[PDB]
Design a protein around this ligand. Structure first.
Ligand SMILES: O[C@@H]1[C@@H](O)[C@H](O[C@@H]2CO[C@@H](O[C@@H]3CO[C@@H](O)[C@H](O)[C@H]3O)[C@H](O)[C@H]2O)OC[C@H]1O
Length: 142
């Protein structure tokens, strides 16, 4: 069993986490809740010049300890095929990876050793044009 250390479930939760849309793409980007689908939604009509120019925490206050093994689980879809970059950890340093999403609601998992104590799920998608939807984020261990 993947025992759940942490969950944020956007099926019901609102969104209050840190996010930063670079001024380059401020007019054409939105980050917030879609209360009909029941998900976090990141919508873009213009690609940014850098992927980190649309960056947002999808989870925070994580109960992770340096050197322990976990999984990050995220349920994601998009309006077209694309890539979500992430890191799990504090601002000093993270365990990094990416998910390649499609138009179906699917769960993605990333196994990692924590590189630090605590932190957040930094998520970046500035190069993606369209709609990204995120249903939940979990941290688990075996
Ligand atoms: O991918 C990298 C980006 O994530 C990075 O963005 C900056 C990251 O630091 C942010 O500032 C933090 C704000 O919260 C405080 O508590 C922290 O101490 C600050 O460091 C800043 O707002 C982001 O622009 O830019 C570099 C990219 O490689």
């Amino acid at each position: 069993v993947d025992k759940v250390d942490y969950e944020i479930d956007y099926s019901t939760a609102g969104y209050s986490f840190w996010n930063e849309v670079n001024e380059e793409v401020k007019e054409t980007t939105t980050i917030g809740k879609n209360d009909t689908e029941g998900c976090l939604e990141i919508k873009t009509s213009v690609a940014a010049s850098q992927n980190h120019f649309i960056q947002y925490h999808t989870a925070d206050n994580l109960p992770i300890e340096i050197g322990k093994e976990y999984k990050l689980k995220m349920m994601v879809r998009g309006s077209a095929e694309g890539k979500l970059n992430f890191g799990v950890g504090p601002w000093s340093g993270r365990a990094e990876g990416s998910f390649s999403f499609n138009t179906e609601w699917k769960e993605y998992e990333f196994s990692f050793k924590a590189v630090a104590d605590g932190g957040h799920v930094m998520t970046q998608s500035g190069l993606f044009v369209g709609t990204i939807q995120i249903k939940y984020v979990k941290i688990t261990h075996s």
